Design a protein around this ligand. Structure first.
Ligand SMILES: O=P(O)(O)OC[C@H]1O[C@](O)(COP(=O)(O)O)[C@@H](O)[C@@H]1O
Ligand SMILES: O=P(O)(O)OC[C@H]1O[C@](O)(COP(=O)(O)O)[C@@H](O)[C@@H]1O
Ligand SMILES: O=P(O)(O)OC[C@H]1O[C@](O)(COP(=O)(O)O)[C@@H](O)[C@@H]1O
Ligand SMILES: O=C([O-])C(=O)[O-]
Ligand SMILES: O=C([O-])C(=O)[O-]
Ligand SMILES: O=C([O-])C(=O)[O-]
Ligand SMILES: [K+]
Ligand SMILES: [K+]
Ligand SMILES: [Mg+2]
Ligand SMILES: [Mg+2]
Ligand SMILES: [Mg+2]
Lengths: 512, 515, 514
């Protein structure tokens, strides 16, 4: 029994669970993409190389902190570490760069502090106190707060750990009662659930950052606090035609984003289940519901989805994660998430590498436990009857791959989409996407199962032989990575002519 | 609005699928189930034999329990004359197989003394005395089976003429038997006799059977329907007689008795296909049990990828009437819904008053039945029970069929020499017709045994560049498709080829628009 | 090893289920599908009519397109004489329903001057009543006096079970000139069918009203209403049956294109449906019948209402003691489709082998019932069942579920109107439903539903209602033992109510047999 072969042959979901075996080793290929946030603990080229070794697929820059040149330097360090392996196209791994926006977030000022259950707290908009915060007065970013808050509303501060109830309202001040204490630091996040904030989804600073990313030639944008389709369209407009290829991933962080989800998903390249803010904005017991709902609909719609925030919190201070954290990652993968994300764990943690290694390990185990019979089956029934060659070839390829127990599905692609279409049907076997486009190579990490492979060889002449060469390139990468051996059987997808959108050929071929 | 039960096939449950079946939903012009017609007095003329091909006959059956070698030699000639009369156009031409159905170990009566009527109660004597072999009446009756008195019993039931006459043995003699008529009816000349629950010792392949098989090999037949097969060793005997000169001739075992049903897995395994011979079976085992046997055998053949023919009395009524009974229409439909590769007419086309109308009716019902097939559940269950194999051809076939459901394709075009590339696509039961393009005339004719395979014979000379030779055969299929109304210009199609010439290199699937 | 296809029903897939079907696995002695026999010259005698009950006839059909009112009045008397001849023993006694099948809006020819028709030779059709008994190869008379208004130059006219076909060449005022398209010999008073032509004959005619009112008086159990085409036609039958016969079940017969199309409309207004294949097979194309049949049986199963598969199930046996392979196959499939009842017409009305025909239906239905994939069936019937807060329904589903679990020999159900039993039936248990009632009419009507064994209690109403219940439960218990449905040690499901009167069933008990 390899990678839960006996588990996947079961008739029922329950019999499948019962047959799950801890002593059944997974395949060396790991399908779920890993996204790491880069900060003080992971910024050095030296450790940044080791994160790629450990399995980081995408690098996140959080734009709610740091200056433009702080990030410009981070990107440089990432590309230095990444291209340090470029001297060997076979073992080399593309690494994407992601810009996560600040967005319409509310922050406190600087502390001059411990708060007590009962003791009152005044909230001012007076900029004279913006660096003089204590147990009596507190300053905020949101200068229009007094228009949307209420006598009796709950205000949450610092990851929703401090809660306050508004007793009295003023013109530019609010009198609150501390409902649960804890200590208050500098520049902390503020939430207002059940209160319709009027801050724009794309602000002035947001426009600056997006235009900056376009120039830094980023791969994707994680747009914070998206609440409707019109907000997604605004991000597109700002990115413009110069960055029209940059992927837009909408972050669902609030009640409205959950509710107008179908509206949003439709207008976006992908979705991130931003659990941090979401866990404050809606009740904490409801998050798993939202998470599973969104991952399912993304799976149904073939668009990428990232499970994010607090997946391994413990590891910010500890070398081993809690049982619940290990359980959380596994389930996120079993839910069908394309990518999983580390934040604090890799930005400011004491154990950034161990945290990444742990994500690889769990995702690989979780991928084996996937009931591929029922999954692929249900994904067919819900797939549309289409007369598009590419789609038909993709379904057929995945189907063939389950039948001949193949080691990989090799796919030649320019824009990435040929590979995207194979991925949405979730084969067991890894999809090796061979492209010459460096950007689509990096972007391919958003999709579950896609192993992007960048070809550096010059364009041969006879297009037939040029194809063959790229196919053999994939073949060598496969052998070297231990995805398959010599005698093994493999699926190869090509097109009848050059250019995007002509994939129509599936071949079953033994390995050289 | 809603073609070939598209709304019916999209249902979640088998019951919801039945409820959504709509009489006003027209089927596709392609009909997948093969039709096999028995040729006799009513269908022997080249002239009417042409019209049977027009109507949809795919295979011609010669029943070798009647007629002389040269009677059949002439029938075959007439068949090939009618078939090649369309050969002047490779696009509209249809290959037609020839089948030899053996006499086998059957028991017959003698001739009625110069129609005798039998009465419930009146006794009847059965003699082996060859002096009475042409002097049969209500008192004496002669038989073929000279070893009958060794396997029959005082109290055994003997059935005569399609099991319509029944007799109980009262006394046993050395060469005679005294019986009591249990239900009457009139007795004719040379009628079939059945002995259920009595182990007959007649050989499966007799001397006459060997003569007929060797004759078929020489007449270059396509398939053998072997009567009264009871075990694997009987199948192996047919192989041996057919020899190396006729090693390509398909062996279809006919299940006609209790033992054949029981050692079925043993038999199917050793045979190229199976025929559910309902006529004799319905006498040999209880009539209420036939449907069980039928459904069991069709399912196991579907599981095993081997062809299966539902046979005998599918449209009896039409021997004398232009319209079939409601039960007969229902029977054909169910046979197809059960998953039968071919359906067969016997008396209906051999000696009937309406041979053509009988064939037209089979086409019509089979086409309607094929639309009503719950393809979601069928294909699905055929995957789960398909073996995990590292054979390129098989993987390409499954993927092709899968792709065809996805892009709603009009056909799956398959280049094949031996037929097997096409066989492997057929066992997964696509909606779309499989157009099998071959140069081998024999595999073209044999391809009719498999559900969904449209054999197409290429007469063009071998082009040079093998690449272009392939392209030409692919375009040949394309033209046949357009002309037959299987697909139009803009339509999407699946094409299966190999990486090099020779059998067993199919590994390439292409999704291609039609010229 | 393996009783009534136990190994076949344990399969994971429909295909694996087919493969595991075994001819050497004997069925249970209980047979669930109801048998309906048409009574005529061959089966009219009290003496043979007793033997039909012995063989398994559950309902008796009277075809009202032939015979006079007193012909039928006599037939009914003979049926009730044969039936009550077993009444001297309540345990072995079997209730037998009486059914009135209407004539309806049918078209007939006149009397022959038999005459032979030839492909090509022309034929004139007259409405002139002077020729109504002078029919030959040149002239032919008809019932439908408004025919010339709905037929066309080029229309096809079918005569005698759709075996003769004619094409209209010229149209007149009261005549039609046709060309014979396929011959055959023409007899007296034969059925005529006009497909694709909208006939304006009323669904319930004057004669139909007379027959319905006659049935009400003869205290019939059900009405098979011919040529129903819309819900308004069903409502007309109700009105005529009135309040004096409001308990008489209305089974609509689907015989034409319009009836198929407005089926949901019809089924919804009717107590049940009959797939009248004879006329339907002429009215719509013969290749399309199986589709219609399977569609209608499925929808009736979904809707919990009875459905009868009818006409030409065993034609061969009108003249032969053994049926054709196709006929044996047809019956089986009709049962496998989920039909509540199967019907013999010519086979028992005018056949040479009425008894052998009934015995054959028993035998096939019993084999077919064993082959039923009960896992998938019951399962799909739950998913499509409505979430209801009705006690009776909940108790029925739970009972059937319990019966699959404890491999029970029966489900015993006390019922007055029959409905408690109807609700258990629609979920299709393996085990036979023994419905114990005192109402003689609901006992006879219970035969319309698959699986229901109606049992009539003749004992006087005991006093303590608790003991009165117990007695009826023990009555069922004795009937079960005597019929060989179960033994002493066996386990059984019992359904009762908390108080007397209809619609209080809410109690399910699992009980060993005395
Ligand atoms: O970007 P897409 O839509 O995946 O297109 C993939 C294309 O790549 C090919 O494999 C060849 O690519 P090139 O044109 O770059 O040589 C085509 O056959 C196919 O149409
Ligand atoms: O059904 P078969 O006998 O395996 O035929 C499949 C063969 O057809 C082909 O497409 C053409 O074969 P030939 O060139 O020998 O005619 C081969 O590539 C492939 O091996
Ligand atoms: O099917 P119905 O007409 O609702 O009959 C069920 C009724 O029969 C009983 O089992 C017996 O009551 P009766 O004595 O009135 O017949 C009741 O408990 C129950 O309400
Ligand atoms: O921004 C995030 O990652 C969040 O809110 O979880
Ligand atoms: O062999 C046959 O076809 C039969 O017995 O019916
Ligand atoms: O009347 C009928 O029963 C029919 O037409 O089938
Ligand atoms: K024969
Ligand atoms: K009638
Ligand atoms: Mg956030
Ligand atoms: Mg035979
Ligand atoms: Mg009728």
């Amino acid at each position: 029994q390899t990678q839960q072969l006996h588990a996947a042959m079961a008739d029922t979901f329950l019999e499948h669970m019962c047959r799950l075996d801890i002593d059944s080793p997974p395949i060396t290929a790991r399908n779920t993409g890993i996204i790491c946030t880069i900060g003080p603990a992971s910024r050095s080229v030296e450790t940044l190389k080791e994160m790629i070794k450990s399995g980081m697929n995408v690098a996140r820059l959080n734009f709610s902190h740091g200056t433009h040149e702080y990030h410009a330097e981070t990107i440089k360090n990432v590309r230095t570490a990444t291209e340090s392996f470029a001297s060997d196209p076979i073992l080399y791994r593309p690494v994407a760069v992601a810009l996560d926006t600040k967005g319409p977030e509310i922050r406190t000022g600087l502390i001059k502090v411990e708060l007590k259950k009962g003791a009152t707290l005044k909230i001012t908009l007076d900029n004279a106190y913006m660096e003089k915060c204590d147990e009596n007065i507190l300053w905020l970013d949101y200068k229009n707060i007094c228009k949307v808050v209420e006598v009796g509303s709950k205000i949450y501060v610092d990851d929703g750990l401090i809660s306050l109830q508004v007793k009295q309202k003023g013109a530019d001040f609010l009198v609150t009662e501390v409902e649960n204490g804890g200590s208050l630091g500098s520049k902390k996040g503020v939430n207002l659930p059940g209160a319709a904030v009027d801050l724009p989804a794309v602000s002035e600073k947001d426009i600056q950052d997006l235009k900056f990313g376009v120039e830094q030639d980023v791969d994707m944008v994680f747009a914070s606090f998206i609440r409707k389709a019109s907000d997604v369209h605004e991000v597109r407009k700002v990115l413009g035609e110069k960055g029209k290829n940059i992927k837009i991933i909408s972050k669902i962080e609030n009640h409205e984003g959950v509710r107008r989800f179908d509206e949003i998903l439709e207008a976006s390249d992908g979705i991130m289940v931003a659990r941090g803010d979401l866990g404050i904005e809606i009740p904490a017991e409801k998050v798993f519901l939202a998470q599973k709902m969104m991952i399912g609909r993304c799976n149904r719609a073939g668009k990428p989805v990232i499970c994010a925030t607090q997946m391994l919190e413990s590891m910010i201070k500890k070398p081993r994660p809690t049982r619940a954290e290990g359980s959380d990652v596994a389930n996120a993968v079993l839910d069908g998430a394309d990518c999983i994300m580390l934040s604090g764990e890799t930005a400011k943690g004491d154990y950034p590498l161990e945290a990444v290694r742990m994500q690889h390990l769990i995702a690989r185990e979780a991928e084996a436990a996937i009931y591929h019979l029922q999954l692929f089956e249900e994904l067919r029934r819900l797939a549309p009857i289409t007369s598009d060659p590419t789609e038909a070839t993709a379904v057929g390829a995945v189907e063939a791959s389950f039948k001949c127990c193949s080691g990989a599905i090799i796919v030649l692609t320019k824009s990435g989409r040929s590979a995207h279409q194979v991925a949405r049907y979730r084969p067991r076997a890894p999809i090796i996407a061979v492209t010459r486009n460096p950007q689509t190579a990096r972007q391919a990490h958003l999709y579950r199962g896609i192993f992007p492979v960048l070809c550096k060889d010059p364009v041969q002449e006879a297009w037939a032989e040029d194809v063959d060469l790229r196919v053999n390139f994939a073949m060598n990468v496969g052998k070297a990575r231990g995805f398959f051996k010599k005698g093994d059987v493999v699926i190869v997808l090509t097109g009848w002519r050059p250019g995007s959108g002509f994939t129509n050929t599936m071949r079953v071929v033994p390995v050289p």
